[PDB]
Protein backbone atom coordinates (compact mmCIF):
# COMPACT_ATOMS: atom_id res chain seq x y z
CA UNK A 1 0.00 0.00 0.00
CA UNK A 2 2.41 2.67 1.22
CA UNK A 3 5.62 3.57 -0.60
CA UNK A 4 8.98 4.62 0.83
CA UNK A 5 11.03 2.69 3.34
CA UNK A 6 10.08 -0.97 3.70
CA UNK A 7 10.98 -2.85 6.87
CA UNK A 8 11.62 -6.59 7.14
CA UNK A 9 12.16 -8.36 10.45
CA UNK A 10 13.61 -11.77 11.31
CA UNK A 11 15.47 -13.53 14.12
CA UNK A 12 18.55 -15.68 13.50
CA UNK A 13 20.33 -17.40 16.42
CA UNK A 14 18.79 -15.04 19.01
CA UNK A 15 19.72 -11.87 17.09
CA UNK A 16 17.00 -9.44 16.01
CA UNK A 17 17.71 -7.86 12.62
CA UNK A 18 16.07 -4.84 11.00
CA UNK A 19 16.42 -4.06 7.29
CA UNK A 20 15.30 -0.83 5.61
CA UNK A 21 14.88 -0.65 1.82
CA UNK A 22 15.22 2.92 0.56
CA UNK A 23 15.02 2.25 -3.20
CA UNK A 24 11.53 3.77 -3.49
CA UNK A 25 12.42 7.28 -2.29
CA UNK A 26 13.39 8.73 -5.70
CA UNK A 27 14.73 12.03 -4.39
CA UNK A 28 17.98 13.75 -3.47
CA UNK A 29 20.13 11.29 -1.55
CA UNK A 30 21.94 13.89 0.58
CA UNK A 31 18.83 15.12 2.40
CA UNK A 32 17.88 11.70 3.81
CA UNK A 33 21.40 10.23 3.90
CA UNK A 34 22.21 11.83 7.27
CA UNK A 35 19.17 10.16 8.90
CA UNK A 36 20.69 6.67 8.60
CA UNK A 37 23.86 7.44 10.56
CA UNK A 38 24.40 4.93 13.35
CA UNK A 39 23.65 1.69 11.50
CA UNK A 40 25.86 -1.32 12.17
CA UNK A 41 26.48 -2.48 8.59
CA UNK A 42 25.49 -1.57 5.04
CA UNK A 43 24.37 -4.40 2.76
CA UNK A 44 25.32 -3.79 -0.88
CA UNK A 45 24.29 -5.85 -3.91
CA UNK A 46 25.92 -6.04 -7.35
CA UNK A 47 25.04 -8.26 -10.32
CA UNK A 48 27.93 -9.71 -12.32
CA UNK A 49 25.71 -10.38 -15.34
CA UNK A 50 25.53 -6.66 -16.16
CA UNK A 51 29.09 -6.68 -17.56
CA UNK A 52 27.77 -7.50 -21.08
CA UNK A 53 24.32 -5.91 -20.56
CA UNK A 54 23.73 -2.21 -21.39
CA UNK A 55 21.07 -2.04 -18.63
CA UNK A 56 21.34 1.78 -18.47
CA UNK A 57 20.38 1.99 -22.21
CA UNK A 58 22.85 4.93 -22.52
CA UNK A 59 25.99 4.16 -24.59
CA UNK A 60 28.16 6.28 -22.23
CA UNK A 61 26.97 4.46 -19.05
CA UNK A 62 27.48 0.68 -18.64
CA UNK A 63 25.66 -0.83 -15.61
CA UNK A 64 28.97 -2.01 -14.11
CA UNK A 65 30.45 1.50 -14.24
CA UNK A 66 27.28 2.96 -12.72
CA UNK A 67 27.40 0.39 -9.90
CA UNK A 68 31.07 1.19 -9.29
CA UNK A 69 30.28 4.92 -9.15
CA UNK A 70 27.40 4.40 -6.72
CA UNK A 71 29.58 2.17 -4.51
CA UNK A 72 32.32 4.81 -4.53
CA UNK A 73 29.84 7.55 -3.61
CA UNK A 74 28.26 5.52 -0.80
CA UNK A 75 31.50 4.19 0.68
CA UNK A 76 33.26 7.55 1.10
CA UNK A 77 30.43 9.56 2.65
CA UNK A 78 31.38 11.78 5.57
CA UNK A 79 28.70 10.23 7.78
CA UNK A 80 29.48 6.56 7.08
CA UNK A 81 33.14 6.70 8.08
CA UNK A 82 33.04 3.70 10.43
CA UNK A 83 30.31 1.45 8.96
CA UNK A 84 31.35 -1.75 7.21
CA UNK A 85 29.97 -2.92 3.85
CA UNK A 86 28.72 -6.45 3.14
CA UNK A 87 29.20 -6.79 -0.61
CA UNK A 88 27.04 -9.39 -2.41
CA UNK A 89 28.10 -10.26 -5.94
CA UNK A 90 25.00 -11.91 -7.37
CA UNK A 91 23.92 -13.99 -10.41
CA UNK A 92 27.05 -16.07 -10.90
CA UNK A 93 25.32 -18.65 -13.13
CA UNK A 94 24.29 -16.54 -16.13
CA UNK A 95 27.58 -14.64 -15.92
CA UNK A 96 29.56 -17.89 -16.07
CA UNK A 97 27.38 -19.00 -18.98
CA UNK A 98 28.00 -15.82 -21.05
CA UNK A 99 31.76 -15.37 -20.30
CA UNK A 100 32.77 -17.77 -23.12
CA UNK A 101 30.25 -16.23 -25.57
CA UNK A 102 31.41 -12.65 -24.80
CA UNK A 103 34.52 -12.34 -22.54
CA UNK A 104 34.82 -9.84 -19.64
CA UNK A 105 37.06 -7.55 -21.75
CA UNK A 106 34.00 -5.61 -22.95
CA UNK A 107 33.57 -3.72 -19.67
CA UNK A 108 37.20 -2.84 -18.97
CA UNK A 109 39.93 -1.94 -21.49
CA UNK A 110 42.32 -3.94 -19.31
CA UNK A 111 42.22 -7.72 -19.90
CA UNK A 112 40.72 -9.87 -17.07
CA UNK A 113 42.53 -12.99 -18.35
CA UNK A 114 41.41 -16.62 -19.09
CA UNK A 115 37.72 -15.85 -19.88
CA UNK A 116 36.55 -18.11 -16.94
CA UNK A 117 34.54 -17.57 -13.75
CA UNK A 118 37.31 -17.73 -11.10
CA UNK A 119 39.62 -15.21 -12.89
CA UNK A 120 36.74 -12.95 -13.99
CA UNK A 121 35.26 -12.86 -10.48
CA UNK A 122 38.65 -12.01 -9.02
CA UNK A 123 39.15 -9.09 -11.44
CA UNK A 124 35.64 -7.64 -10.90
CA UNK A 125 35.94 -7.98 -7.09
CA UNK A 126 39.43 -6.53 -6.70
CA UNK A 127 38.25 -3.59 -8.83
CA UNK A 128 35.26 -3.04 -6.52
CA UNK A 129 37.20 -3.43 -3.27
CA UNK A 130 39.91 -0.98 -4.38
CA UNK A 131 37.35 1.83 -4.57
CA UNK A 132 37.47 2.41 -0.80
CA UNK A 133 40.13 4.58 0.82
CA UNK A 134 39.26 4.52 4.55
CA UNK A 135 40.94 1.13 4.98
CA UNK A 136 41.92 1.99 8.55
CA UNK A 137 38.37 2.13 9.91
CA UNK A 138 36.11 0.16 7.53
CA UNK A 139 36.31 -3.21 5.78
CA UNK A 140 34.35 -5.07 3.10
CA UNK A 141 33.05 -8.65 3.21
CA UNK A 142 32.29 -10.42 -0.10
CA UNK A 143 30.12 -13.58 -0.59
CA UNK A 144 29.02 -15.13 -3.91
CA UNK A 145 25.31 -15.90 -3.56
CA UNK A 146 24.32 -19.54 -3.08
CA UNK A 147 20.60 -20.01 -3.68
CA UNK A 148 19.99 -23.56 -2.46
CA UNK A 149 21.52 -23.48 1.03
CA UNK A 150 21.39 -20.88 3.82
CA UNK A 151 24.90 -19.48 3.32
CA UNK A 152 23.34 -16.06 2.75
CA UNK A 153 21.96 -15.61 6.27
CA UNK A 154 24.96 -17.20 8.00
CA UNK A 155 27.45 -14.90 6.27
CA UNK A 156 25.47 -11.81 7.32
CA UNK A 157 25.23 -13.10 10.90
CA UNK A 158 28.96 -13.80 11.13
CA UNK A 159 29.87 -10.45 9.58
CA UNK A 160 27.62 -8.60 12.03
CA UNK A 161 29.14 -10.52 14.95
CA UNK A 162 32.67 -9.65 13.79
CA UNK A 163 31.73 -5.98 13.37
CA UNK A 164 30.25 -5.87 16.88
CA UNK A 165 33.31 -7.52 18.42
CA UNK A 166 35.70 -5.16 16.63
CA UNK A 167 33.59 -2.14 17.62
CA UNK A 168 33.66 -3.11 21.33
CA UNK A 169 37.43 -3.74 21.31
CA UNK A 170 38.07 -0.31 19.66
CA UNK A 171 35.92 1.47 22.29
CA UNK A 172 37.87 -0.22 25.10
CA UNK A 173 40.89 1.21 23.31
CA UNK A 174 42.55 -2.20 22.90
CA UNK A 175 42.15 -2.24 19.11
Amino acid sequence: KTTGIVETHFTFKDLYFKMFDVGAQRSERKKWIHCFEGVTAIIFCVALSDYDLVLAEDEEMNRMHASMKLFDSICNNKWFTETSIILFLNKKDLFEEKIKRSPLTICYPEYTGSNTYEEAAAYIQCQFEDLNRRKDTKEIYTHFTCSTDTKNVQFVFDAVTDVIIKNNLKECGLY
Binding site: T2, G4, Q25, S27
Partner: protein
Amino acid sequence: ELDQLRQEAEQLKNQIRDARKACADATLSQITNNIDPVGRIQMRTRRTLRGHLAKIYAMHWGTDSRLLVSASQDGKLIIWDSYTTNKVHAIPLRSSWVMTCAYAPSGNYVACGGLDNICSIYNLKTREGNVRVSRELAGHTGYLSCCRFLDDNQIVTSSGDTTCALWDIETGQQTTTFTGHTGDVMSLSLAPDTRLFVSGACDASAKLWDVREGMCRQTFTGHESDINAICFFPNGNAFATGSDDATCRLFDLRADQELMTYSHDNIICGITSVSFSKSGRLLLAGYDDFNCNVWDALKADRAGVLAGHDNRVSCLGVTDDGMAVATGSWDSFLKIWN
Protein backbone atom coordinates in the same frame (compact mmCIF):
# COMPACT_ATOMS: atom_id res chain seq x y z
CA GLU B 1 9.71 27.72 -32.16
CA LEU B 2 11.38 26.50 -28.92
CA ASP B 3 14.40 28.80 -29.49
CA GLN B 4 12.03 31.77 -30.09
CA LEU B 5 10.14 30.93 -26.85
CA ARG B 6 13.48 30.82 -24.95
CA GLN B 7 14.50 34.23 -26.41
CA GLU B 8 11.09 35.63 -25.32
CA ALA B 9 11.67 34.25 -21.79
CA GLU B 10 15.14 35.87 -21.65
CA GLN B 11 13.68 39.25 -22.78
CA LEU B 12 10.92 39.03 -20.09
CA LYS B 13 13.57 38.29 -17.42
CA ASN B 14 15.61 41.30 -18.64
CA GLN B 15 12.51 43.57 -18.43
CA ILE B 16 11.71 42.39 -14.84
CA ARG B 17 15.36 42.95 -13.80
CA ASP B 18 15.30 46.48 -15.31
CA ALA B 19 12.09 47.36 -13.37
CA ARG B 20 13.64 46.07 -10.10
CA LYS B 21 16.85 48.10 -10.83
CA ALA B 22 14.79 51.28 -11.41
CA CYS B 23 12.90 50.79 -8.11
CA ALA B 24 16.29 50.61 -6.30
CA ASP B 25 16.89 54.21 -5.20
CA ALA B 26 18.08 53.90 -1.58
CA THR B 27 19.35 51.21 0.79
CA LEU B 28 18.00 49.88 4.08
CA SER B 29 21.24 50.88 5.80
CA GLN B 30 20.83 54.49 4.63
CA ILE B 31 17.48 54.79 6.42
CA THR B 32 19.05 53.04 9.44
CA ASN B 33 22.16 55.24 9.54
CA ASN B 34 21.06 57.34 12.53
CA ILE B 35 19.20 54.72 14.60
CA ASP B 36 20.80 53.81 17.92
CA PRO B 37 22.19 50.27 18.28
CA VAL B 38 20.40 47.63 20.30
CA GLY B 39 23.65 46.67 22.01
CA ARG B 40 24.71 43.37 23.51
CA ILE B 41 21.84 41.26 24.88
CA GLN B 42 22.58 38.38 27.26
CA MET B 43 20.08 35.56 27.81
CA ARG B 44 20.26 32.66 30.26
CA THR B 45 18.75 29.19 30.30
CA ARG B 46 15.84 29.06 32.74
CA ARG B 47 14.38 25.58 32.14
CA THR B 48 15.99 22.52 30.56
CA LEU B 49 13.96 19.50 29.47
CA ARG B 50 15.03 15.85 29.27
CA GLY B 51 13.45 12.58 28.22
CA HIS B 52 14.34 11.97 24.59
CA LEU B 53 16.81 9.32 23.46
CA ALA B 54 17.71 10.23 19.86
CA LYS B 55 18.29 13.20 17.56
CA ILE B 56 15.62 15.92 17.64
CA TYR B 57 14.41 17.09 14.23
CA ALA B 58 11.47 19.44 14.84
CA MET B 59 9.74 21.76 17.31
CA HIS B 60 6.71 24.05 17.30
CA TRP B 61 5.50 26.36 20.05
CA GLY B 62 1.88 26.35 21.14
CA THR B 63 -0.65 29.12 20.69
CA ASP B 64 -0.82 29.70 24.46
CA SER B 65 3.00 29.96 24.73
CA ARG B 66 3.12 27.26 27.43
CA LEU B 67 3.05 23.89 25.61
CA LEU B 68 5.43 22.81 22.85
CA VAL B 69 5.68 19.68 20.71
CA SER B 70 8.95 17.99 19.71
CA ALA B 71 9.77 14.92 17.62
CA SER B 72 12.81 12.64 17.41
CA GLN B 73 14.05 9.83 15.19
CA ASP B 74 12.85 7.30 17.78
CA GLY B 75 9.07 6.86 17.45
CA LYS B 76 8.08 9.43 20.11
CA LEU B 77 6.08 12.72 20.07
CA ILE B 78 6.27 14.36 23.52
CA ILE B 79 4.12 17.34 24.52
CA TRP B 80 6.08 19.41 27.04
CA ASP B 81 5.20 22.15 29.53
CA SER B 82 7.62 25.07 29.73
CA TYR B 83 6.41 26.53 33.04
CA THR B 84 6.96 23.26 34.96
CA THR B 85 8.83 20.36 33.36
CA ASN B 86 6.03 17.78 33.24
CA LYS B 87 5.31 15.69 30.17
CA VAL B 88 1.65 15.35 29.20
CA HIS B 89 1.53 12.99 26.20
CA ALA B 90 3.89 10.61 24.43
CA ILE B 91 2.41 9.18 21.23
CA PRO B 92 4.09 6.10 19.71
CA LEU B 93 4.64 6.35 15.96
CA ARG B 94 4.31 3.62 13.35
CA SER B 95 7.35 4.82 11.37
CA SER B 96 10.43 6.06 13.24
CA TRP B 97 11.64 8.49 10.55
CA VAL B 98 9.96 11.73 11.64
CA MET B 99 11.24 14.93 10.04
CA THR B 100 8.69 17.63 11.00
CA CYS B 101 6.00 18.39 13.55
CA ALA B 102 3.30 21.02 13.98
CA TYR B 103 0.89 22.17 16.68
CA ALA B 104 -2.71 23.18 16.05
CA PRO B 105 -3.72 26.83 16.48
CA SER B 106 -6.86 25.58 18.22
CA GLY B 107 -4.75 23.23 20.34
CA ASN B 108 -6.54 19.96 19.56
CA TYR B 109 -4.22 18.33 17.00
CA VAL B 110 -0.58 17.69 16.10
CA ALA B 111 1.18 16.43 12.98
CA CYS B 112 4.16 14.34 11.88
CA GLY B 113 5.84 13.20 8.68
CA GLY B 114 9.05 11.94 7.17
CA LEU B 115 10.51 9.48 4.69
CA ASP B 116 7.31 7.40 4.86
CA ASN B 117 5.74 10.03 2.54
CA ILE B 118 2.56 10.19 4.65
CA CYS B 119 1.31 13.04 6.83
CA SER B 120 -0.45 11.85 9.99
CA ILE B 121 -2.82 13.83 12.21
CA TYR B 122 -3.17 12.81 15.86
CA ASN B 123 -6.18 13.43 18.11
CA LEU B 124 -4.42 15.39 20.83
CA LYS B 125 -7.78 16.32 22.34
CA THR B 126 -9.25 13.76 24.73
CA ARG B 127 -10.85 11.07 22.54
CA GLU B 128 -12.04 8.42 25.03
CA GLY B 129 -8.82 8.99 26.99
CA ASN B 130 -6.54 7.67 24.24
CA VAL B 131 -4.73 9.09 21.21
CA ARG B 132 -5.17 7.49 17.79
CA VAL B 133 -4.24 8.37 14.21
CA SER B 134 -7.20 10.42 12.97
CA ARG B 135 -6.27 10.28 9.28
CA GLU B 136 -3.27 9.45 7.11
CA LEU B 137 -2.87 11.64 4.03
CA ALA B 138 -1.17 9.81 1.16
CA GLY B 139 -0.38 10.83 -2.40
CA HIS B 140 3.00 12.52 -2.18
CA THR B 141 5.85 10.76 -3.98
CA GLY B 142 8.93 11.93 -2.08
CA TYR B 143 9.55 12.60 1.59
CA LEU B 144 7.46 15.18 3.45
CA SER B 145 9.81 17.92 4.64
CA CYS B 146 7.43 20.46 6.22
CA CYS B 147 3.81 20.96 7.24
CA ARG B 148 1.78 23.74 8.86
CA PHE B 149 -1.87 23.80 9.96
CA LEU B 150 -4.09 26.52 8.44
CA ASP B 151 -7.21 25.53 10.41
CA ASP B 152 -8.84 22.50 12.03
CA ASN B 153 -9.80 21.14 8.58
CA GLN B 154 -7.13 22.44 6.16
CA ILE B 155 -3.43 21.51 6.16
CA VAL B 156 -0.56 22.63 3.93
CA THR B 157 2.35 20.24 3.34
CA SER B 158 5.54 20.45 1.30
CA SER B 159 7.40 17.41 0.03
CA GLY B 160 10.50 16.31 -1.86
CA ASP B 161 8.48 15.76 -5.03
CA THR B 162 9.10 19.44 -5.91
CA THR B 163 5.45 20.08 -5.07
CA CYS B 164 3.39 21.66 -2.30
CA ALA B 165 -0.23 20.79 -1.66
CA LEU B 166 -3.34 21.76 0.30
CA TRP B 167 -5.24 18.83 1.81
CA ASP B 168 -8.69 18.22 3.28
CA ILE B 169 -8.62 16.42 6.62
CA GLU B 170 -12.33 15.53 6.55
CA THR B 171 -12.09 13.79 3.15
CA GLY B 172 -8.41 12.91 2.72
CA GLN B 173 -7.87 14.07 -0.87
CA GLN B 174 -5.87 17.14 -1.85
CA THR B 175 -7.95 19.91 -3.41
CA THR B 176 -5.18 22.15 -4.80
CA THR B 177 -1.66 21.36 -6.01
CA PHE B 178 1.14 23.93 -6.23
CA THR B 179 3.66 23.27 -9.01
CA GLY B 180 6.58 25.25 -10.37
CA HIS B 181 9.54 24.41 -8.16
CA THR B 182 12.44 22.68 -9.90
CA GLY B 183 14.03 21.37 -6.69
CA ASP B 184 13.18 19.61 -3.46
CA VAL B 185 11.12 21.97 -1.31
CA MET B 186 12.68 22.22 2.14
CA SER B 187 10.84 24.91 4.13
CA LEU B 188 7.37 26.44 4.41
CA SER B 189 5.83 29.30 6.41
CA LEU B 190 2.39 30.91 6.45
CA ALA B 191 1.28 34.53 6.53
CA PRO B 192 -0.68 35.81 9.55
CA ASP B 193 -3.79 36.40 7.42
CA THR B 194 -3.72 32.74 6.28
CA ARG B 195 -4.19 33.65 2.61
CA LEU B 196 -0.60 33.47 1.37
CA PHE B 197 2.45 31.36 2.14
CA VAL B 198 6.07 31.08 1.01
CA SER B 199 8.39 28.15 0.39
CA GLY B 200 11.97 27.41 -0.58
CA ALA B 201 13.60 24.54 -2.48
CA CYS B 202 17.03 23.12 -3.28
CA ASP B 203 17.12 25.35 -6.36
CA ALA B 204 17.89 28.89 -5.26
CA SER B 205 14.39 30.38 -5.38
CA ALA B 206 11.55 31.45 -3.11
CA LYS B 207 7.94 31.74 -4.24
CA LEU B 208 4.84 33.54 -2.96
CA TRP B 209 1.73 31.42 -3.56
CA ASP B 210 -1.92 32.02 -2.76
CA VAL B 211 -4.11 29.36 -1.16
CA ARG B 212 -7.26 30.38 -3.06
CA GLU B 213 -6.21 30.67 -6.72
CA GLY B 214 -3.28 28.27 -6.32
CA MET B 215 -0.91 30.17 -8.62
CA CYS B 216 2.57 31.59 -8.14
CA ARG B 217 2.84 35.34 -8.60
CA GLN B 218 6.34 36.36 -7.45
CA THR B 219 9.79 34.75 -7.38
CA PHE B 220 12.77 35.86 -5.29
CA THR B 221 16.35 34.81 -6.06
CA GLY B 222 19.75 35.82 -4.72
CA HIS B 223 20.98 32.76 -2.85
CA GLU B 224 23.66 30.52 -4.36
CA SER B 225 22.94 27.24 -2.53
CA ASP B 226 20.19 25.23 -0.86
CA ILE B 227 17.64 27.00 1.34
CA ASN B 228 16.63 25.34 4.61
CA ALA B 229 14.49 27.71 6.69
CA ILE B 230 12.06 30.58 6.13
CA CYS B 231 9.67 32.74 8.17
CA PHE B 232 7.56 35.87 7.76
CA PHE B 233 8.00 39.31 9.29
CA PRO B 234 5.45 40.16 12.01
CA ASN B 235 3.68 42.71 9.78
CA GLY B 236 3.32 40.13 7.00
CA ASN B 237 5.07 42.28 4.36
CA ALA B 238 8.54 40.71 4.53
CA PHE B 239 10.34 37.44 5.16
CA ALA B 240 13.84 36.24 6.00
CA THR B 241 15.67 33.26 4.53
CA GLY B 242 18.44 30.93 5.64
CA SER B 243 20.69 28.96 3.31
CA ASP B 244 23.83 26.80 3.33
CA ASP B 245 25.98 29.76 2.21
CA ALA B 246 26.27 30.95 5.85
CA THR B 247 24.10 33.94 4.89
CA CYS B 248 20.64 35.20 5.82
CA ARG B 249 18.76 37.70 3.67
CA LEU B 250 15.67 39.89 4.01
CA PHE B 251 13.14 40.24 1.19
CA ASP B 252 10.08 42.48 0.97
CA LEU B 253 6.97 41.57 -1.01
CA ARG B 254 5.87 45.08 -2.01
CA ALA B 255 9.25 46.23 -3.34
CA ASP B 256 10.15 42.78 -4.81
CA GLN B 257 13.89 42.96 -3.96
CA GLU B 258 16.68 42.25 -1.45
CA LEU B 259 17.72 44.44 1.47
CA MET B 260 20.40 42.90 3.72
CA THR B 261 22.87 40.00 3.84
CA TYR B 262 23.38 38.97 7.48
CA SER B 263 26.78 37.28 7.54
CA HIS B 264 30.23 37.44 9.10
CA ASP B 265 33.75 36.26 8.35
CA ASN B 266 33.79 33.95 11.38
CA ILE B 267 30.71 31.92 10.34
CA ILE B 268 31.05 29.33 7.57
CA CYS B 269 28.44 26.64 8.32
CA GLY B 270 24.89 26.71 6.99
CA ILE B 271 21.65 27.81 8.62
CA THR B 272 19.07 25.27 9.78
CA SER B 273 16.42 27.45 11.45
CA VAL B 274 15.34 31.09 11.30
CA SER B 275 12.85 32.91 13.52
CA PHE B 276 11.78 36.51 14.09
CA SER B 277 11.24 38.21 17.43
CA LYS B 278 8.24 40.39 18.19
CA SER B 279 8.23 43.76 16.38
CA GLY B 280 10.92 42.30 14.13
CA ARG B 281 13.89 44.01 15.78
CA LEU B 282 15.71 40.78 16.72
CA LEU B 283 16.35 37.94 14.28
CA LEU B 284 17.31 34.50 15.60
CA ALA B 285 19.27 32.01 13.49
CA GLY B 286 20.46 28.45 14.06
CA TYR B 287 23.85 27.31 12.81
CA ASP B 288 25.62 23.98 12.43
CA ASP B 289 28.59 24.92 14.63
CA PHE B 290 26.69 24.23 17.88
CA ASN B 291 25.74 27.92 18.18
CA CYS B 292 22.68 30.15 17.91
CA ASN B 293 23.06 33.78 16.85
CA VAL B 294 21.08 36.96 17.52
CA TRP B 295 21.06 39.59 14.79
CA ASP B 296 19.79 43.12 14.24
CA ALA B 297 17.24 43.41 11.44
CA LEU B 298 17.87 47.12 10.84
CA LYS B 299 21.69 47.28 11.00
CA ALA B 300 22.94 43.65 10.85
CA ASP B 301 25.24 43.47 13.86
CA ARG B 302 25.46 40.78 16.54
CA ALA B 303 23.55 41.41 19.77
CA GLY B 304 24.30 38.13 21.56
CA VAL B 305 25.41 34.54 21.25
CA LEU B 306 23.65 31.45 22.61
CA ALA B 307 25.75 28.38 23.43
CA GLY B 308 24.36 25.49 25.46
CA HIS B 309 24.37 22.62 22.96
CA ASP B 310 27.18 20.16 22.28
CA ASN B 311 25.66 19.04 18.95
CA ARG B 312 24.17 20.64 15.85
CA VAL B 313 21.19 22.95 16.38
CA SER B 314 18.34 21.99 14.06
CA CYS B 315 15.22 23.81 15.28
CA LEU B 316 14.20 26.87 17.27
CA GLY B 317 11.23 29.16 17.74
CA VAL B 318 9.80 32.15 19.59
CA THR B 319 6.56 32.29 21.57
CA ASP B 320 3.55 34.31 20.44
CA ASP B 321 4.15 37.00 23.08
CA GLY B 322 7.91 37.01 22.49
CA MET B 323 8.72 36.03 26.07
CA ALA B 324 11.13 33.12 25.52
CA VAL B 325 13.20 31.32 22.89
CA ALA B 326 13.39 27.53 22.67
CA THR B 327 16.20 25.66 20.92
CA GLY B 328 16.53 22.04 19.82
CA SER B 329 19.73 20.20 18.96
CA TRP B 330 20.87 16.82 17.68
CA ASP B 331 21.26 15.59 21.26
CA SER B 332 18.20 14.71 23.36
CA PHE B 333 17.82 18.07 25.13
CA LEU B 334 15.67 21.18 24.79
CA LYS B 335 16.40 24.57 26.33
CA ILE B 336 14.56 27.84 26.96
CA TRP B 337 16.46 31.14 26.86
CA ASN B 338 15.15 34.30 28.49
